[PDB]
Amino acid sequence: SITTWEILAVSMSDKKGICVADPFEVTVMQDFFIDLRLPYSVVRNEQVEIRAVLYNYRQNQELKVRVELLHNPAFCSLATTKRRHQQTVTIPPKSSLSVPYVIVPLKTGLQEVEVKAAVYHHFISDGVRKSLKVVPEGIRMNKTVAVRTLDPERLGREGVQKEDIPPADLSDQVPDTESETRILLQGTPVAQMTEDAVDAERLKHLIVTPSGCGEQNMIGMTPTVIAVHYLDETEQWEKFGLEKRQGALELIKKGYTQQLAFRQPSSAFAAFVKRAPSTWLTAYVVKVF
Amino acid sequence: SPMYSIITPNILRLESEETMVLEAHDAQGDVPVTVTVHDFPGKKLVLSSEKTVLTPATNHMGNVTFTIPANREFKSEKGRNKFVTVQATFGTQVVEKVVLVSLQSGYLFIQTDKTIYTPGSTVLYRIFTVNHKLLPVGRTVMVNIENPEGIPVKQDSLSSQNQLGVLPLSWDIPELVNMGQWKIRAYYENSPQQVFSTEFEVKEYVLPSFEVIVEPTEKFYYIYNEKGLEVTITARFLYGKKVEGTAFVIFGIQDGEQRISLPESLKRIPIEDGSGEVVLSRKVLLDGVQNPRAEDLVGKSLYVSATVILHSGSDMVQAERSGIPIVTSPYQIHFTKTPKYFKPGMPFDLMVFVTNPDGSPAYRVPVAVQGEDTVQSLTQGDGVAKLSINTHPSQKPLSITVRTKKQELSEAEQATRTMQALPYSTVGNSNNYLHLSVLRTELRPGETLNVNFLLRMDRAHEAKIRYYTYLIMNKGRLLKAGRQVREPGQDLVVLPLSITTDFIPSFRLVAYYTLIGASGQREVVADSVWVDVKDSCVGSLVVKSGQSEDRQPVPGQQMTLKIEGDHGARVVLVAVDKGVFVLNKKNKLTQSKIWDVVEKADIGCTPGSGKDYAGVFSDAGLTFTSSSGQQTAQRAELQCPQPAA
Amino acid sequence: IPIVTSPYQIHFTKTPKYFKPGMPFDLMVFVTNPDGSPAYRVPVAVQGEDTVQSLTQGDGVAKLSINTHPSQKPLSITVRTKKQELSEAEQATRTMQALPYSTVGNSNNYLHLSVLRTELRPGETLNVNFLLRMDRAHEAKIRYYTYLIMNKGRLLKAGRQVREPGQDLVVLPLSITTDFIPSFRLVAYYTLIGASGQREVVADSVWVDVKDSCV
Amino acid sequence: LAQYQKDAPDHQELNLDVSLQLPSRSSKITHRIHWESASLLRSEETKE
Ligand SMILES: *[C@@H]1O[C@H](CO)[C@@H](O[C@@H]2O[C@H](CO)[C@@H](O)[C@H](O)[C@H]2NC(C)=O)[C@H](O)[C@H]1NC(C)=O
Ligand SMILES: *[C@@H]1O[C@H](CO)[C@@H](O[C@@H]2O[C@H](CO)[C@@H](O)[C@H](O)[C@H]2NC(C)=O)[C@H](O)[C@H]1NC(C)=O
Ligand SMILES: *[C@@H]1O[C@H](CO)[C@@H](O[C@@H]2O[C@H](CO)[C@@H](O)[C@H](O)[C@H]2NC(C)=O)[C@H](O)[C@H]1NC(C)=O
């Protein structure tokens, strides 16, 4: 290909990381050459015009060129094995010349086209061999076969569901052409069923320092213990304050320390060690702990 | 008693190295320090490693490191915020602080052989897998290819381990395909919420043989210009020779996302000597719109569409220039690089960012402060101008207004911007400040930078300040930190800082001192400033020709490609015809766009300074916590608070 | 073609010879190739501590600075290159000794000038920093500095820079034009009546270089 | 209220096992639809 190539390079270093280099340009060129500019695709069995462009970049020399379209068993034109379809043209210096040709595609597929040209009195020549798609008449259709809801609990009954997809009838399909069946599945996102939680605006007051007797210590420890657990599951520490959980951990840990001071030697609890053990208070601490 | 201190970033990242800075202030003798990282909430224990001893020989300093792993337990919650709390034990006095966690694990870059493809053709693509340090990482990547409406058609899962962070892959486009925009989306296995993407186009095309360039004389339109918009046409073949042909050019107006076309602005000009020129007059514009007001045209944008055909009639290229603004001012002034917090009674620096209307930096435009015409300065190469004021001890916010003084241009054409700065608040209004001042230049690795530290306090406490504590934030982690000692009477000290490739693309320098002042109260004063580094590669990769002669090689000819680069690096290559980029040059990856994505992931939100010492660190992206009780402000959001604009 | 042991030659010709006791002092070190051409990107260091280094700029000047103690004793200055791979014997070095600034009657009232060190082109602005050093009992009497610009043997520019109480450091933006070529000196001074009613005048100066170009 | 949350009731109960019997029938394409794939797209292509 005669063009300017842009070379992109990226380097990967374990010590100097990734690096994208400046694009590097390489200009490939020939003084005289041809450019056969085909359409991307052509319809089968319809005459079309092709455009071959011949470039001459001499600064003071016009060139007499013999240009020839070669024979092709897949395309019909004046070019036959006995009779070649050749023309003699002249290209002025620092100019370009286009030589049109007429052809007819005869068979489908990515078929081959070749052209050659040679100048007189200089032995400088060029040839272009390219391929383009021969497409039969028709057009793309993306019709939908079926769209249905799947629900094995509701359809089929007792948790089992079976269903068929009939093939598309498509009587207008072009003979011997590809046809894809695109299958897509997507589940149904079901949310909600959740009520709002307390916004923790007026809950900032439940941070209480435990103090007093054993039952009094449990009274002060009661609201602080459940509040951290509530804010954890409601993940409302963003509004409440992340620093306040660490402070509450100190108070809860402090309450656990003071509570063990009123423990009876039989693992019982009361307001004082002198007071008879309280069965209710013993169960309350177990619920709290 | 001495005060212990722990310094860590605002946000911690999974699967990446995290710097941990430990210091003790005014300490006596050695103090052992043990390190432990816990989960939050609850206690399951995620890391128990690392310990150190703060030594008076080291000025009670010690930097330690750790890495946050990723498992099924960490990766459970994907949509909401979760946190982990590191606890630091200074001898028997423990200090602990809750820290934000980011679920991001690195970066993903995707390269394709072309920007636009044909049905029935092959797509070659390579993915570079790097962490947050831009070094090759070995992790499992999940890649997906989606159709124009977002249907995944092909998906991959592979590890880049032992492949030097490069995943070369390929895929074939079927002939049965819907042409349009197609997107490749990828994400790491341990960070499924951080998704990267890049787009390519599918079309039935043939490459043209020449390029069409549409060049406005100015990348904007001034409304009261009598002549109107001048657009120069430039066309040449892909191999670099001049094009001869005829062009049809049309103009239009873009309002938001909706485009309106001006039918009568059409012109037909021949293209000669590989160039052309067309002018859209002001009268035609006013005739195109139904609104005779010229004030309503301000803020809207223009676009140009050109259709060029060779005089051989065998080829045709359509080129477009769009987004040309209709404004009253050829410039746009911004305080984006200027701190919003000043120090009362101390000089304050102004870093003004002046740009062209499109968004490109303006070069050598003289701007001045609205107050007093004597203070002017010309913008540097990166579009930044240096201005400074001599602040009074006013505790009231100070309004700052900057206005360009470019010659010949009228006052209506002069850009201007207005803001209002906020005063620094000291501890108990003690009026004891710290001032940072630093040179403003395009900083290249290999140069030294002098950081200037100015101390402000009554000399009864100046003897108590024996050191400064400084740290460097770069790319969301602590790069360097240390102490700068100070002797009595030396209020100003200078620290030369050497710039290396690690400081690219930008870094923040924070510094602070501490003492017990007032009536026996711990005081912490801080200051910060954000610095820019010139965009470049960490290493240096250069591609050039091996041959020194035989210009314009012949097709198929052997030539030598010469590649100069750092030793030990792996290089990937791709050579494409420039005609593909003339059809579509979008999504082209470059080193500058890489540094652009890094800056967009920064956790710092302010060009330095702050309302107080806590705001200095919190704006820079740091968390501070001491045994005394002083600590940084709580932050629970990954993003930066949005300016009012 | 010189026959030397060191690929470099260090000179203090562009370095000031007088430091301010108890005040930072800047060192402008001129490092050259043996022929006389400026050396590029050679790391030189202070004799004290190998960590304090700096690479030479484009014009063959290296920027170093120290934080002097209030020592009235002369300060020994030694600069030595730390270029890698080359042995220590190949590293050039130079030694000098600076002298302390003497105030009026050793009153310990100083003026300090500090200026950026880069290749300065006309059309850019330069921030001049004025630092006052004295006991704050007399700081309220210094309300301004008086500066002048010497260029090519004549006074180019002069003016006042006001100062408020408590603001020992002030910044003056100076725009560089083609008239400052090739180099200029900035002198500054303040004045007051101190001690028991005695006139005191303290001064300071600094030399600045400009990049070669036409007017 | 904490026990209401914590294991907060939700509408999703996805446990779908979906399988296809292909005309080639060399194998049966089978997928699972749970909560993490609730709105996940699954696409397949045949050339006939
Ligand atoms: C057939 O295929 C086309 C694509 O070739 C699809 O319709 C496209 O839908 C997008 C919206 O996402 C539009 O932007 C395109 O303009 C549509 N293309 C058309 C209308 O040709 C879709 O898959 C099918 N559309 C029809 C109309 O059959
Ligand atoms: C944190 O500690 C590490 C110790 O691993 C320091 O790394 C060393 O730094 C010294 C001096 O800068 C170098 O001479 C060593 O070569 C480094 N170690 C290695 C293995 O190369 C690091 O500098 C410290 N950082 C801070 C900010 O204190
Ligand atoms: C000395 O006096 C001259 C008076 O000629 C001053 O020059 C003028 O400076 C002002 C600045 O505001 C300009 O607007 C005038 O145009 C200048 N005069 C002329 C004739 O051009 C000069 O500034 C004074 N100071 C110095 C240091 O020269």
Q: Does D8 sit within 8 Å of A234, measured CB to CB?
A: no
Fold match, B330-431 / B537-600: no
The residue whose CA has the least distance to atom 23 of ligand 1 is: A142
Chains C/A: 3 or more C-beta pairs closer than 8 A?
Answer: no
The domain that holds A55 is classified in CATH as 2.60.40.10
The tokens for C183 are 């180099």
Report the SS3 class of residue B584: coil
Class of domain B1-106+601-632: mainly beta
A4 lines ligand 1 (CB under 6 A): no
Please state the CATH superfamily assignment of the domain spanning residues C109-213 in this structure: Macroglobulin (MG2) domain (2.60.40.1930)
Chain B residues interacting with chain D (CB cutoff of 8 angstroms):
150-153, 174
3-state SS of chain C? CCCCCCCCEEECCCCCCEECCCCEEEEEEEEECCCCCECCCCEEEECCCCCCEEECCCCCEEEEEEECCCCCCCEEEEEEECCCCCCHHHCCEEEEEEEECCCHHHCCCEEEEECCCCCCCCCCEEEEEEEEECCCCCHHHCCEEEEEEEECCEEEEEEEEECCCCCCEEEEEEECCHHHCCEEEEEEEEEEEECCCEEEEEEEEEEEECCCCCC
Which burial class, exposed, middle or buried, applies to B251 when counting CB atoms under 10 A from its CB (0-12, 13-18, 19+)? buried
Report the SS3 class of residue A240: helix
Looking at this protein, which amino acid is placed at residue A248? A
Q: Which atom of ligand 1 is nearest to the CA of B149?
A: 12
Resolution (A): 6.0
Domain boundaries, chain B: 1-106+601-632, 107-207, 208-329, 330-431, 432-536, 537-600
φ/ψ bin of B518: left (φ > 0), alpha (ψ from -120 to 50), beta (otherwise): left
Q: State how beta strands B83-90 and B229-237 pair.
A: unpaired
Only one residue has tokens 């010690």, namely B62
For B107-207, the fitting CATH number among 3.10.20.30, 2.60.40.1930, 1.10.10.10, 2.40.10.220 is: 2.60.40.1930
Helix axis angle, A214-233 to A243-259, nearest 10°: 150
Q: How far is the CA of B614 from the centre of ligand 2 (A)?
A: 28
Domain B432-536 has CATH 3.30.70.3190: no
Which burial class, exposed, middle or buried, applies to B43 when counting CB atoms under 10 A from its CB (0-12, 13-18, 19+)? exposed
Question: Residues 369..398 of B with a Cβ closer than 8 Å to C: which?
Answer: 375-378, 380, 386-388, 390, 392-393
Q: Which residues of B282-309 are buried (b: 16+ CB within 10 A; e: fewer)?
A: bebbeebeeeeeeeebeebbbbbbbebe
The H-or-E segment that residue B525 falls in is strand B521-532
3-state SS of B452-516? EEEEECCCCCHHHCCEEEEEEEECCEEEEEEEEECCCCCCEEEEEEECCHHHCCEEEEEEEEEEE
What CATH number was assigned to the domain covering residues C7-108? 2.60.40.10
Q: Which residues of B381-417 are buried (b: 16+ CB within 10 A; e: fewer)?
A: eebbbbbbbbbeeeeeebebebbbebeebeeebbbeb
Q: Which fold has domain B537-600?
A: N-terminal domain of TfIIb (6.20.50)
B149 lines ligand 1 (CB under 6 A): yes
Are the C-beta atoms of residues B273 and B328 closer than 8 Å to each other?
A: no
Q: Nearest CA to A200 among A229, A223, A231?
A: A231
Are the C-beta atoms of residues B622 and B8 closer than 8 Å to each other?
A: yes
Q: Which chain B residues are within 8 Å of C22, Cβ to Cβ?
A: 487, 489-490
B480 lines ligand 2 (CB under 6 A): yes
Q: Which chain A residues are within 8 Å of B570, Cβ to Cβ?
A: 11-13
Q: How far is the CA of C93 from the centre of ligand 2 (A)?
A: 28
Full DSSP string of A20-78? EPPPEEEE---SEEEEEE--SEEETT--EEEEEEEEE--SS--EEEEEEEPP-TTEESS
Are the C-beta atoms of residues C173 and C115 closer than 8 Å to each other?
A: no
Class of domain B208-329: mainly beta
CA distance B617 to C52: 27
CA distances from B237 to A210, A226, B112 (A): 86, 77, 25
φ/ψ bin of B113: left (φ > 0), alpha (ψ from -120 to 50), beta (otherwise): alpha
The tokens for D27 are 């194998």
Question: How far is residue B336 CA from its own chain's centroid?
Answer: 12
Q: Does A178 sit within 8 Å of D45, measured CB to CB?
A: no
ω before B505 within 30° of 0 (cis)? yes
**Residue B481: nearest ligand to its CA?**
2
Please state the CATH superfamily assignment of the domain spanning residues B330-431 in this structure: Immunoglobulins (2.60.40.10)
Q: Nearest CA to B212 among B308, B329, B338?
A: B308
The H-or-E segment that residue B529 falls in is strand B521-532
Q: Residues with Cβ < 8 Å from B598, sequence gap 6 or more? A: B107, B134, B475, B505
